[PDB]
Amino acid sequence: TIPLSRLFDNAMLRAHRLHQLAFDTYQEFEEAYIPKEQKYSFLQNPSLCFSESIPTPSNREETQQKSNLELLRISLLLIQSWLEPVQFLRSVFANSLVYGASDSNVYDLLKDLEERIQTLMGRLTGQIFKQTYSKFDTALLKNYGLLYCFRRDMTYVATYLRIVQCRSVEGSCGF
Amino acid sequence: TIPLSRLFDNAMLRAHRLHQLAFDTYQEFEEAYIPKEQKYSFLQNPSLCFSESIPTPSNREETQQKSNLELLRISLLLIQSWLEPVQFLRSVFANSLVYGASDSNVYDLLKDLEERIQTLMGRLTGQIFKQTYSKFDTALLKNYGLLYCFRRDMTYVATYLRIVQCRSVEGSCGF
Amino acid sequence: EPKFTKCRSPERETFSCHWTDEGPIQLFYTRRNEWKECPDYVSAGENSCYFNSSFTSIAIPYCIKLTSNGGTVDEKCFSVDEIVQPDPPIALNWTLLNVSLTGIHADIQVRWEAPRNADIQKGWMVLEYELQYKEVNETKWKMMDPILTTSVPVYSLKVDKEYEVRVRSKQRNSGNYGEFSEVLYVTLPQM
Amino acid sequence: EPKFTKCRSPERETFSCHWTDEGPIQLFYTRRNEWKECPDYVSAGENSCYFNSSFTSIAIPYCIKLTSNGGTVDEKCFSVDEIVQPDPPIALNWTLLNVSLTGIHADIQVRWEAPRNADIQKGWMVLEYELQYKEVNETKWKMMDPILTTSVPVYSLKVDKEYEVRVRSKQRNSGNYGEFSEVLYVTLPQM
């Protein structure tokens, strides 16, 4: 088979960039607009993101028990869940000082990654293959909640994609 | 014990420099003064150097069978054999274009290395411990013959010293 | 009056929280999965709580509260990835890089290993490293930009001087740098 | 008319001699230890003589003569260290060194292993390496100064271009460089 290293390198570059943008945008926002008491109330109350229908392992042992195709499929559904909702972070990202943060630029990144994950599942050919991507609901807590969920979901994708890379590519992580 | 790495590094720097100076000085001399027919006659006739009383292994298996103290002791006697004779390469080295070649500079190097080998034998405490260093005899073939023997003996010292280093120092050659 | 100093996860799999020194001070925590008392007050030392891999999950928010006999004295909320601070690299070593025998200067290559508790080989963690070095008599350290590998050159060191080098790590894009490795001393041969 | 092309020792332990293509051409050798016929005309290929480790010793001079049915047609004299030319390094690989996600440029680290027949670990050989690289559409190669390690960075490559890298070795201060390794292709991710 044609070597997969180039595709994994390119898919990982975009996943890391989405993860970095989500983390830095959440941090800036929280530091500027959210006093510590509103933070505690927000974080004490049970962050059930619109993507909670997609089953996402959250510790090392459970994640590594999943197959390559399951981890790519979950990544695919997380990315697709943000294609429409990301336009609701338009004002967040325009007011941001993070270089590269705009909903257009983020939308472009997600679409590019969704097609790369689909090519990777083709090369490596259960409810998770049956279900579809998640749908989002209907101001500053609404933006904070959204940013919280975007950070989380991009975090998952970057991790799940790295795991598949390390197991599928020759000497990618420890040569 | 105090770590030996620093002393081995310093002894190896001087051995390599002596070896390099001997190799480059022999090559320059041969290329400038010795036509190919005189070279064949010289190399066809059985280079018995004044140091042939010192027993010197000349292949990998026989050399590595020697102990650390034997290899240091042979190195010590080779270096000491050149303390007096090196002054007979005075005109060779003064006419040379090799940077650093002079009998004074070479004499200094040999004396410095002889004391370092003696400290190293002290830290790591047979005929070879009984015998002494070799003595040299009484114009252009006399210089060619001398240069031939100096190249040879410095070659041996650099090799024998490297072998002891690799076996005595932690991860010196293949970490 | 007692207050939290910090919380840290060394490998993204476990974590611990620490506080400064009425009645005994207690720790209570809540995570989406309400309030429970610290599961282990001994493993991470004095005025600490230790949370093993059965209590630790990424992406979900944790809230902790320090309490006395009169009430709540401190509170913190965090996610595990915000508190990741990796252990330092170990087994530092150097070797000569350039091949000269007469320079007044020399280049070296320094190498190390990742902290043993980090899962790099199967993709759970991805580290970056920041190396620092200075002449042993200097008070300030020179700082290199961070790299992805476990080895790097250091250029133009004077062979006449002794140097010292230290390295620390961080998880890419999250948490903070951890502590520095033990120092490695560099003494170059000279003549 | 037939003449010697060259003699080479790959690891300082064995050696072979080669000649260009009346009657059959013979090889005779003499070493201080007179004339004997080539011990093995097959192992090093056509118009060659192969000398295993039982005939090979450092520091002593060898002389060889090529002979026809009418007499001696060529002669050479050498010592083993003058003809050492190491096999190339193997297992070339690269990985990203810098940690940026938005550069137009990138730095890499390239690594390799010494040729398997060389005895580096016990001190019989000491190697230096020269790395070359260029953009795949270029005809000339950029050449780095030689190094002592089996890894090195290559800096400021354009992420938009494909590169290729090759490495060769030599025994320190003697003999010549050997052949280049197989080429390693470098294709950097980009967005």
XYZ file of C-alpha atoms in Angstrom:
732
model
C 0.000 0.000 0.000
C 1.030 3.624 -0.521
C 2.665 4.784 2.734
C 0.229 6.551 5.112
C 2.744 8.785 6.829
C 2.130 11.824 4.613
C -1.685 11.753 5.079
C -1.387 11.242 8.894
C 1.101 14.150 9.065
C -1.280 16.439 7.204
C -4.397 15.353 9.177
C -2.443 15.840 12.481
C -1.322 19.366 11.521
C -4.983 20.480 11.127
C -6.181 18.633 14.282
C -3.455 20.248 16.424
C -4.243 23.694 14.980
C -7.973 23.241 15.760
C -7.071 22.093 19.289
C -4.698 25.038 19.821
C -7.232 27.576 18.527
C -9.974 26.122 20.778
C -7.740 26.097 23.877
C -6.361 29.656 23.422
C -9.789 31.132 22.558
C -11.416 29.530 25.607
C -8.612 30.794 27.908
C -8.686 34.411 26.566
C -12.468 34.541 26.829
C -12.562 33.132 30.389
C -9.783 35.531 31.585
C -11.465 38.609 30.103
C -15.200 38.059 30.678
C -15.771 35.586 33.525
C -15.157 36.448 37.182
C -14.172 33.520 39.485
C -17.623 33.114 41.131
C -19.441 32.767 37.811
C -16.691 30.285 36.811
C -17.315 28.087 39.896
C -21.100 28.153 39.390
C -20.643 27.269 35.696
C -18.151 24.414 36.320
C -20.045 23.006 39.337
C -23.206 22.577 37.260
C -23.642 19.366 35.245
C -21.310 20.950 30.821
C -23.494 18.375 29.042
C -22.493 19.456 25.503
C -24.774 18.923 22.489
C -22.213 16.229 21.433
C -22.925 13.918 24.445
C -24.895 11.509 22.223
C -21.522 10.563 20.652
C -19.841 8.090 22.981
C -16.328 9.385 23.798
C -13.861 7.402 25.977
C -12.040 9.649 28.472
C -9.128 7.748 30.077
C -6.137 6.050 28.529
C -7.120 2.404 29.020
C -10.660 2.753 27.641
C -9.524 4.819 24.659
C -6.738 2.443 23.661
C -9.152 -0.572 23.804
C -11.044 0.946 20.835
C -10.153 -0.112 17.255
C -8.646 2.280 14.691
C -11.895 2.568 12.744
C -13.947 3.258 15.888
C -11.576 6.094 16.955
C -11.576 7.583 13.435
C -15.411 7.265 13.259
C -15.898 9.035 16.605
C -13.480 11.771 15.414
C -15.426 12.091 12.214
C -18.768 12.601 14.029
C -17.258 15.155 16.457
C -15.870 17.282 13.588
C -19.134 17.051 11.620
C -21.148 18.122 14.703
C -19.337 21.528 14.610
C -19.859 22.405 10.888
C -23.101 24.325 11.582
C -22.668 25.444 15.229
C -19.249 27.047 14.680
C -21.066 29.972 13.014
C -22.444 30.810 16.507
C -18.886 31.656 17.635
C -18.620 34.337 14.949
C -18.619 37.285 17.365
C -16.464 35.404 19.882
C -13.711 34.777 17.310
C -13.903 38.249 15.683
C -13.328 40.033 19.000
C -10.493 37.586 19.825
C -6.800 38.485 19.802
C -5.883 34.886 18.839
C -4.162 34.912 15.415
C -6.296 32.995 12.914
C -9.532 32.847 14.893
C -12.578 33.624 12.730
C -15.593 31.393 12.083
C -14.697 31.252 8.339
C -11.147 30.117 9.003
C -12.414 27.577 11.612
C -15.210 26.344 9.339
C -12.556 25.777 6.579
C -10.326 23.791 8.906
C -13.204 21.516 10.052
C -14.338 20.795 6.484
C -10.722 20.056 5.411
C -10.251 17.687 8.393
C -13.618 15.892 7.845
C -12.551 14.981 4.249
C -9.092 13.831 5.487
C -10.589 11.591 8.159
C -12.924 10.106 5.484
C -9.916 9.294 3.223
C -8.100 7.700 6.192
C -11.105 5.480 7.037
C -11.137 4.398 3.360
C -7.467 3.355 3.587
C -7.884 1.333 6.795
C -11.147 -0.378 5.789
C -21.789 -1.218 16.199
C -24.032 1.774 17.069
C -21.246 4.247 16.227
C -21.311 3.323 12.524
C -25.132 3.616 12.695
C -25.559 7.023 14.379
C -25.168 10.472 12.883
C -23.552 13.679 14.074
C -25.027 15.818 16.862
C -27.290 18.838 16.503
C -27.163 22.045 18.518
C -29.997 23.993 20.187
C -31.304 27.561 19.920
C -25.568 35.292 25.662
C -22.223 35.423 27.390
C -22.911 32.179 29.234
C -24.185 30.833 25.944
C -20.845 31.775 24.381
C -18.839 30.403 27.372
C -20.782 27.107 27.223
C -20.197 26.830 23.475
C -16.474 27.565 23.811
C -16.299 25.012 26.605
C -17.809 22.323 24.343
C -15.593 23.255 21.337
C -12.412 22.965 23.462
C -13.509 19.560 24.735
C -14.457 18.090 21.334
C -11.270 19.375 19.573
C -9.278 17.917 22.513
C -10.816 14.498 21.854
C -10.170 14.627 18.131
C -6.480 15.534 18.511
C -5.960 12.649 20.975
C -7.937 10.005 19.064
C -6.169 10.924 15.827
C -2.698 10.727 17.454
C -3.444 7.250 18.858
C -4.411 5.876 15.410
C -1.268 7.474 13.880
C 1.054 5.896 16.475
C -0.468 2.438 15.836
C -0.719 2.666 12.040
C 2.486 4.410 11.086
C 5.831 2.786 11.150
C 7.931 4.587 13.746
C 5.824 7.714 14.220
C 5.874 7.957 18.057
C 9.031 6.279 19.471
C 10.717 5.376 16.257
C 36.096 6.564 41.948
C 36.354 9.963 40.262
C 34.861 9.575 36.764
C 37.483 8.820 34.068
C 35.666 10.392 31.155
C 37.452 13.752 31.360
C 40.971 12.203 31.403
C 40.137 9.791 28.507
C 38.721 12.730 26.499
C 41.891 14.745 27.007
C 44.271 11.808 26.297
C 42.254 10.981 23.100
C 42.440 14.578 21.822
C 46.284 14.464 21.902
C 46.492 10.910 20.444
C 44.232 11.842 17.503
C 46.237 15.028 16.862
C 49.519 13.040 16.849
C 47.940 10.494 14.481
C 46.607 13.223 12.166
C 49.945 15.065 12.083
C 51.824 11.813 11.310
C 49.399 10.798 8.539
C 49.301 14.225 6.799
C 53.091 14.724 7.042
C 53.792 11.278 5.579
C 51.330 11.877 2.692
C 52.708 15.369 1.800
C 56.280 14.098 1.896
C 55.550 11.011 -0.252
C 53.591 13.086 -2.853
C 56.321 15.722 -3.167
C 59.598 13.772 -2.957
C 59.044 10.112 -3.876
C 58.373 8.941 -7.436
C 56.264 5.739 -7.812
C 59.211 3.397 -8.594
C 61.146 4.385 -5.475
C 57.858 3.929 -3.553
C 57.419 0.330 -4.816
C 61.052 -0.564 -4.050
C 60.712 0.957 -0.556
C 57.379 -0.769 0.260
C 58.398 -4.137 -1.256
C 61.444 -4.336 1.018
C 61.019 -5.820 4.509
C 59.789 -1.395 7.044
C 61.190 -3.088 10.165
C 60.959 0.029 12.384
C 63.238 0.555 15.401
C 60.065 -0.093 17.507
C 59.679 -3.766 16.376
C 60.978 -5.016 19.747
C 57.659 -3.776 21.226
C 55.040 -6.420 20.505
C 52.072 -4.743 18.754
C 48.887 -6.674 17.805
C 47.648 -5.747 14.313
C 44.130 -7.151 13.746
C 40.925 -6.623 15.662
C 40.618 -10.008 17.381
C 44.201 -10.122 18.686
C 44.106 -6.516 19.886
C 40.817 -6.880 21.745
C 42.096 -10.051 23.546
C 44.670 -7.853 25.347
C 43.854 -6.388 28.799
C 43.472 -2.644 29.434
C 46.820 -2.395 31.213
C 48.653 -4.276 28.443
C 47.233 -1.928 25.746
C 48.073 1.167 27.826
C 51.595 -0.221 28.538
C 52.286 -0.880 24.843
C 51.019 2.660 24.062
C 53.279 4.052 26.724
C 56.402 2.353 25.282
C 55.563 3.450 21.706
C 55.238 7.123 22.753
C 58.434 6.980 24.838
C 60.361 5.438 21.904
C 59.770 8.685 19.906
C 60.924 11.254 22.545
C 64.525 11.290 21.236
C 64.108 10.263 17.560
C 61.468 12.903 16.775
C 64.294 15.481 16.712
C 65.506 13.738 13.504
C 62.319 14.912 11.740
C 63.210 18.543 12.443
C 63.918 19.462 8.812
C 61.025 17.321 7.559
C 58.495 19.160 9.751
C 59.966 22.660 9.186
C 59.665 22.373 5.398
C 56.122 20.958 5.787
C 52.941 22.855 4.931
C 51.011 20.930 7.630
C 49.750 23.407 10.267
C 51.391 22.636 13.613
C 54.184 20.376 12.391
C 57.522 21.186 14.056
C 59.701 18.858 16.135
C 59.194 21.119 19.214
C 55.419 21.031 18.933
C 55.523 17.225 18.318
C 57.985 16.637 21.164
C 55.586 18.595 23.487
C 52.608 16.504 22.441
C 54.461 13.193 23.051
C 55.658 14.253 26.512
C 52.127 15.454 27.440
C 50.613 12.136 26.245
C 53.254 9.975 28.037
C 52.321 11.618 31.403
C 48.570 11.170 30.666
C 48.980 7.486 29.857
C 50.968 7.077 33.127
C 48.105 8.684 35.138
C 45.579 6.403 33.386
C 47.600 3.259 34.227
C 47.654 4.462 37.867
C 43.842 4.725 37.884
C 43.252 1.260 36.401
C 45.870 -0.550 38.513
C 54.548 -10.418 31.469
C 57.538 -9.335 29.318
C 55.804 -6.071 28.357
C 55.943 -4.744 31.933
C 59.615 -5.853 32.019
C 60.948 -4.315 28.781
C 61.850 -0.715 28.062
C 61.248 1.604 25.134
C 63.044 1.217 21.795
C 66.187 2.997 20.645
C 66.901 4.377 17.189
C 70.028 4.026 15.019
C 72.440 6.484 13.392
C 68.965 11.078 3.776
C 65.684 11.303 1.936
C 65.093 7.571 2.284
C 66.191 7.953 5.877
C 63.513 10.624 6.305
C 60.877 8.563 4.393
C 61.653 5.491 6.543
C 61.394 7.549 9.732
C 58.096 9.131 8.667
C 56.820 5.681 7.760
C 57.600 4.387 11.273
C 56.124 7.487 13.012
C 52.821 7.116 11.095
C 52.620 3.445 12.046
C 53.382 3.899 15.766
C 50.980 6.894 16.183
C 48.335 4.790 14.362
C 48.741 2.038 16.960
C 48.554 4.412 19.896
C 45.338 6.092 18.703
C 43.664 2.683 18.218
C 44.862 1.076 21.464
C 43.826 4.150 23.447
C 40.332 4.221 21.859
C 39.764 0.536 22.706
C 40.580 1.084 26.414
C 38.297 4.175 26.470
C 35.338 2.278 24.967
C 35.714 -0.510 27.569
C 36.411 1.691 30.602
C 34.058 4.595 30.095
C 30.379 4.398 30.603
C 28.723 5.017 27.247
C 31.669 6.467 25.334
C 31.310 4.540 22.027
C 27.653 3.492 21.470
C 26.102 5.130 24.452
C -7.202 30.978 56.142
C -5.519 27.851 54.719
C -5.598 28.173 50.878
C -4.921 25.899 47.894
C -1.429 26.333 46.392
C -1.839 24.057 43.361
C -3.225 20.995 41.551
C -1.169 19.008 39.014
C -1.447 15.886 36.786
C 2.014 14.515 35.864
C 0.942 12.186 33.008
C -2.675 12.952 32.211
C -3.759 9.829 34.140
C -3.668 10.684 37.888
C -3.617 14.050 39.786
C -2.938 15.603 43.177
C -3.907 18.899 44.931
C -1.966 20.743 47.715
C -2.770 23.471 50.235
C -0.834 25.709 52.706
C -0.575 24.880 56.403
C -9.938 25.451 62.810
C -9.635 21.697 63.472
C -8.308 19.403 60.714
C -8.595 20.695 57.154
C -10.670 18.527 54.806
C -10.862 18.283 50.995
C -14.145 17.551 49.159
C -14.512 17.124 45.367
C -17.318 16.974 42.783
C -17.152 15.794 39.132
C -19.925 15.065 36.602
C -20.213 11.270 37.154
C -21.997 15.582 43.930
C -19.643 16.084 46.967
C -17.300 13.326 48.226
C -14.356 13.551 50.660
C -10.751 13.206 49.386
C -10.064 9.551 48.683
C -6.385 9.599 49.836
C -4.706 12.111 52.155
C -1.288 10.363 52.378
C 0.195 9.446 48.955
C 1.020 13.009 47.785
C 2.412 14.092 51.174
C 1.319 16.548 53.851
C -1.630 18.890 53.171
C -2.469 17.055 49.942
C -5.072 14.778 48.260
C -4.155 12.080 45.690
C -6.495 10.925 42.917
C -5.569 7.686 41.211
C -6.517 6.620 37.637
C -9.925 5.355 38.759
C -10.982 8.994 39.626
C -9.323 10.770 36.665
C -10.976 11.582 33.367
C -10.103 14.112 30.629
C -12.506 16.697 29.240
C -14.842 16.771 32.360
C -14.694 19.611 34.952
C -13.673 18.984 38.595
C -14.407 21.294 41.541
C -12.643 21.034 44.909
C -13.358 22.745 48.247
C -11.103 23.076 51.306
C -13.149 23.028 54.559
C -12.543 23.744 58.262
C -14.729 23.281 61.361
C -16.447 26.607 60.650
C -16.960 26.185 56.890
C -15.490 26.429 53.374
C -12.128 28.226 53.274
C -11.096 27.836 49.563
C -12.455 26.594 46.192
C -11.028 25.732 42.755
C -12.430 24.371 39.499
C -10.333 22.867 36.638
C -10.135 20.238 33.913
C -7.296 17.697 33.866
C -5.663 19.098 30.681
C -5.425 22.569 32.291
C -3.322 21.104 35.142
C -0.932 18.763 33.221
C 2.689 19.529 34.117
C 4.996 16.732 33.055
C 7.844 15.236 35.068
C 11.257 16.138 33.681
C 13.334 14.283 31.150
C 15.980 11.944 32.575
C 19.267 10.385 31.473
C 20.830 13.579 30.080
C 24.151 13.037 28.256
C 26.278 15.001 25.742
C 28.871 14.183 23.083
C 31.052 16.180 20.665
C 29.387 17.053 17.355
C 32.143 18.865 15.356
C 35.244 16.976 14.168
C 38.072 19.508 14.731
C 41.123 18.934 16.896
C 42.385 22.555 17.156
C 39.405 24.870 17.722
C 39.094 27.335 20.576
C 35.367 26.516 20.308
C 33.329 23.312 20.054
C 29.787 22.232 19.220
C 28.077 19.469 21.197
C 24.877 17.403 20.914
C 22.778 16.899 24.084
C 20.273 14.033 24.426
C 17.701 12.774 26.894
C 14.772 10.495 27.479
C 11.105 11.401 28.163
C 9.877 10.954 31.783
C 9.056 7.243 32.309
C 5.390 7.721 33.361
C 4.339 9.535 30.121
C 2.624 7.514 27.393
C 4.292 8.844 24.273
C 4.561 5.535 22.374
C 0.779 4.932 22.141
C -0.290 8.542 21.709
C -1.845 9.523 25.083
C 0.699 12.348 25.528
C 2.721 14.497 23.036
C 5.608 16.460 24.593
C 7.705 19.497 23.697
C 10.998 20.261 25.532
C 12.787 23.508 26.458
C 16.589 23.314 26.994
C 18.610 25.956 28.934
C 22.415 26.254 29.381
C 25.026 28.696 30.787
C 28.705 28.872 31.876
C 28.890 27.503 35.485
C 29.996 30.876 36.905
C 27.083 32.807 35.350
C 23.822 33.667 37.180
C 21.568 33.851 34.116
C 20.671 30.930 31.816
C 20.366 31.155 28.004
C 16.984 29.778 26.836
C 16.369 27.913 23.575
C 13.025 27.773 21.744
C 11.115 24.557 22.439
C 11.622 21.431 20.289
C 9.840 18.147 19.596
C 12.820 15.776 19.691
C 14.812 14.285 22.553
C 18.139 15.636 21.307
C 19.625 18.946 20.022
C 22.993 20.642 19.332
C 24.445 23.460 21.424
C 26.915 25.511 19.341
C 30.093 27.543 19.889
C 30.989 26.682 23.499
C 34.485 27.814 24.605
C 36.667 24.736 25.326
C 38.296 26.688 28.150
C 35.049 27.066 30.124
C 32.752 24.640 31.993
C 29.040 24.672 31.057
C 25.820 23.219 32.542
C 22.540 22.265 30.830
C 18.965 21.562 32.066
C 15.707 20.561 30.268
C 11.965 20.664 31.108
C 8.811 19.440 29.306
C 5.209 20.327 28.569
C 2.218 18.698 26.864
C 1.658 20.359 23.481
C -0.767 23.261 23.621
C -1.965 22.712 27.226
C -1.104 22.883 30.945
C 2.290 24.309 31.870
C 5.990 23.353 31.820
C 7.020 21.038 34.704
C 10.246 21.135 36.755
C 13.756 21.102 35.261
C 15.760 17.872 34.956
C 18.913 17.410 37.072
C 21.733 19.551 35.680
C 24.223 18.068 33.241
C 27.775 19.415 33.531
C 29.805 19.928 30.293
C 33.604 19.918 30.462
C 35.241 19.890 26.994
C 38.748 18.480 26.381
C 41.351 21.128 25.557
C 44.966 21.511 24.523
C 47.190 -3.196 -20.862
C 44.738 -4.257 -18.123
C 45.307 -1.904 -15.122
C 44.238 -1.771 -11.465
C 41.247 0.526 -10.822
C 41.204 0.332 -7.015
C 41.700 -1.458 -3.680
C 39.381 -0.907 -0.692
C 38.858 -2.152 2.909
C 35.253 -1.570 4.078
C 35.797 -2.116 7.838
C 39.529 -2.258 8.439
C 39.341 -6.073 8.691
C 39.150 -7.468 5.112
C 39.999 -5.927 1.672
C 39.518 -6.399 -2.059
C 41.319 -5.161 -5.237
C 39.807 -4.665 -8.757
C 41.190 -4.234 -12.270
C 39.843 -3.264 -15.749
C 38.954 -5.867 -18.367
C 47.294 -12.018 -23.020
C 45.726 -15.164 -21.514
C 44.015 -14.961 -18.099
C 45.066 -12.088 -15.848
C 46.555 -13.118 -12.495
C 47.045 -11.252 -9.194
C 50.082 -11.857 -6.938
C 50.674 -10.198 -3.533
C 53.528 -9.788 -1.030
C 53.362 -8.611 2.621
C 55.992 -8.664 5.397
C 54.978 -11.971 7.077
C 57.362 -13.006 -0.728
C 55.001 -13.545 -3.755
C 51.776 -15.598 -3.501
C 48.832 -15.823 -5.935
C 45.459 -14.212 -5.059
C 43.701 -16.400 -2.519
C 40.138 -15.812 -3.873
C 39.137 -14.631 -7.352
C 35.333 -14.987 -6.914
C 33.990 -13.309 -3.730
C 34.486 -9.662 -4.826
C 33.183 -10.263 -8.367
C 34.734 -10.221 -11.828
C 38.335 -9.005 -12.267
C 38.859 -8.890 -8.497
C 40.741 -10.544 -5.580
C 39.267 -10.888 -2.054
C 41.376 -10.991 1.114
C 39.629 -12.226 4.226
C 40.539 -11.366 7.865
C 43.221 -14.061 7.988
C 45.306 -12.096 5.360
C 44.621 -8.556 6.650
C 46.775 -6.638 9.090
C 47.052 -2.898 9.857
C 50.291 -0.925 9.814
C 52.195 -3.356 7.435
C 52.711 -2.571 3.704
C 51.177 -4.743 0.940
C 52.316 -4.846 -2.699
C 50.230 -6.343 -5.515
C 51.116 -7.116 -9.148
C 48.791 -7.830 -12.086
C 50.369 -10.335 -14.538
C 49.654 -11.646 -18.053
C 51.245 -14.429 -20.132
C 54.010 -12.042 -21.216
C 54.739 -10.445 -17.826
C 53.793 -7.830 -15.208
C 51.223 -5.309 -16.465
C 50.504 -3.214 -13.290
C 51.723 -2.734 -9.680
C 50.451 -1.025 -6.509
C 51.661 -0.714 -2.923
C 49.492 0.400 0.060
C 48.732 -0.037 3.750
C 45.243 -1.038 4.910
C 44.486 2.332 6.595
C 45.222 4.175 3.315
C 42.480 2.151 1.560
C 39.669 2.198 4.203
C 36.419 3.460 2.669
C 33.451 2.654 4.863
C 30.084 1.313 3.742
C 27.307 3.880 4.039
C 25.010 4.535 6.947
C 21.618 2.809 6.799
C 18.134 3.291 8.240
C 17.840 7.018 7.458
C 14.726 8.690 8.926
C 13.618 12.279 9.695
C 11.184 13.969 12.081
C 10.026 17.547 12.747
C 12.211 19.515 15.164
C 10.410 22.904 15.528
C 7.002 23.121 17.241
C 5.104 25.665 15.083
C 1.828 25.011 13.304
C 1.788 28.050 10.951
C 5.283 28.545 9.502
C 6.084 28.748 5.810
C 9.351 27.062 6.864
C 10.256 24.088 9.060
C 13.323 22.576 10.708
C 13.835 18.808 10.785
C 16.205 16.346 12.491
C 17.693 13.521 10.366
C 19.086 10.324 11.930
C 20.847 7.156 10.854
C 22.804 4.136 11.934
C 26.477 3.264 11.239
C 27.118 0.514 8.624
C 26.635 -2.888 10.333
C 30.131 -4.292 9.572
C 32.038 -1.445 11.347
C 33.274 -2.034 14.896
C 32.453 1.256 16.563
C 31.321 -0.137 19.941
C 34.707 -1.695 20.852
C 36.926 0.964 19.314
C 38.362 -0.660 16.142
C 36.840 2.081 13.948
C 35.887 5.766 14.607
C 33.649 7.340 11.938
C 32.752 10.844 10.778
C 29.715 11.477 8.505
C 28.989 14.031 5.756
C 25.296 14.815 5.034
C 24.053 16.418 1.760
C 20.525 17.630 0.839
C 18.718 19.567 -1.943
C 15.203 20.288 -3.315
C 14.218 17.296 -5.554
C 14.126 19.451 -8.710
C 17.649 20.850 -8.202
C 20.809 19.437 -9.859
C 23.301 20.549 -7.201
C 23.432 19.296 -3.590
C 24.180 21.486 -0.537
C 27.035 19.984 1.536
C 27.341 20.166 5.326
C 30.627 19.992 7.255
C 31.312 16.524 8.662
C 30.041 15.485 12.120
C 30.723 12.777 14.697
C 27.143 11.874 15.631
C 24.495 9.788 13.892
C 21.931 12.591 13.833
C 21.736 16.322 12.905
C 19.187 19.096 12.190
C 18.521 20.564 8.752
C 17.073 24.091 9.081
C 14.687 26.373 7.177
C 13.198 24.001 4.584
C 10.164 25.386 2.687
C 7.041 23.334 3.578
C 5.853 23.789 -0.003
C 8.829 21.932 -1.511
C 10.014 18.292 -1.474
C 13.611 17.633 -0.342
C 16.018 14.654 -0.433
C 18.968 13.810 1.843
C 21.977 11.427 1.577
C 24.901 10.604 3.949
C 28.369 9.004 3.579
C 31.122 8.045 6.066
C 34.872 7.968 6.549
C 37.332 6.697 9.166
C 38.741 9.666 11.094
C 41.948 11.026 9.614
C 42.529 8.216 7.065
C 41.396 6.563 3.812
C 38.572 8.240 1.912
C 34.787 8.734 2.107
C 32.775 5.694 0.906
C 29.563 5.674 -1.170
C 26.403 7.615 -0.275
C 23.502 5.958 1.566
C 20.172 5.451 -0.246
C 18.355 8.778 -0.572
C 15.780 9.802 2.012
C 12.846 11.823 0.663
C 11.433 14.671 2.844
C 7.838 15.800 2.324
C 6.642 18.233 5.036
C 2.950 18.629 5.967
C 1.443 21.959 4.913
C -1.728 23.997 5.186
